[PDB]
Amino acid sequence: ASLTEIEHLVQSVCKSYRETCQLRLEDLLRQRSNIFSREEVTGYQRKSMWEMWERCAHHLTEAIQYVVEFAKRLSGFMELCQNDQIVLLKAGAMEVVLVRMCRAYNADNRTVFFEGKYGGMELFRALGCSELISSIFDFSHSLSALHFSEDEIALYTALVLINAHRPGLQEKRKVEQLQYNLELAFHHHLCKTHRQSILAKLPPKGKLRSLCSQHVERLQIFQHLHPIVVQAAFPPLYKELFSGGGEKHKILHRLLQDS
Ligand code: NA
């Protein structure tokens, strides 16, 4: 590409991200005083393990559905073959969601916007995956220290998704070229905004890989404890992405096929 084309990619990526945000940042900030009461927190903690897992899986599936739409609107993504579209989404959808989560996290009080209000990690105690929860909260806490702009989150999550190193890509070189153009767009934007200092502060990729592995692993523990709940009450797209073998369900291909 060249300078006009790079800036066009910058604006296109930021537009795609705005149109596929579940919640506007302003909406999330305005809600910061709306925190679960101690009695509402006690009620979450008295919910059964399987109901809290189902509710979190539903919450996560809705966020993932927006990431799929982001991908479809991302320059060049729909040009890739369907095998590679699916490889990239299966690998990076949750990674994007974990990054997007910092917008909904309040570092002042260590709360996250969940089911209409802000609550701390104690809200999730019924899940029985305390390590994963605090790992996710610590990750959001670290990202919040970066003070991402919406444009920065747009460009960075595009790169999280368009990763040419994902195992299973049939057209690796084509993904390499798309990745390179998006890197140019991200780094051009950082250069023009004097934000290149954030490059050193971005999490290593192995950290997002690790969080995703923990989630799958805790799911396997839960699935062993309540296999019928997973089969009957977990969202089909969630099972396709995370549960073994859940990927007999193909939701993604329909989400990609339908306009
Ligand atoms: Na934040």
Cα–Cα separations (whole angstroms), residue 154 to 67, 116, 128, 177? 11, 24, 33, 19
Which tokens in the block code for residue 242? 């995370």
* CA 161–ligand 1 middle distance (angstroms): 21
Determination technique for this entry: X-ray
Do the Cβ atoms of 136 and 211 come closer than 8 Å?
yes
Q: Where are the domains of the chain?
A: 1-259
Q: What is the DSSP letter of 204?
A: P
Residue 157 exposure: Cα atoms within 13 Å on the Cβ side = 35
Q: Are 101 and 25 in contact (CB under 8 A)?
A: no
Partnered with residue 224 across adjacent β-strands are: none
Question: 146 C-alpha to center of ligand 1: Å?
Answer: 9
Would you state the CATH architecture of domain 1-259? Orthogonal Bundle (1.10)
Under 8 Å between Cβ of 71 and 77: yes
Amino acid at 39: E
The alpha carbon of 219 and the centre of ligand 1 are apart by a number of angstroms equal to 26
Q: What is the CA radius of gyration of the chain?
A: 19
User: d(Cα 10, Cα 55) in Å, to the nearest integer?
Assistant: 35
Resolution (A): 2.0
Distance 209 CA to ligand 1 centre (A): 21
What is the DSSP secondary-structure string of 206-232?
A: HHHHHHHHHHHHHHHHHHHH-HHHHHH
Nearest to 216 by CA among 123, 93, 99, 119: 93
Structure tokens belonging to residue 186: 């991200």
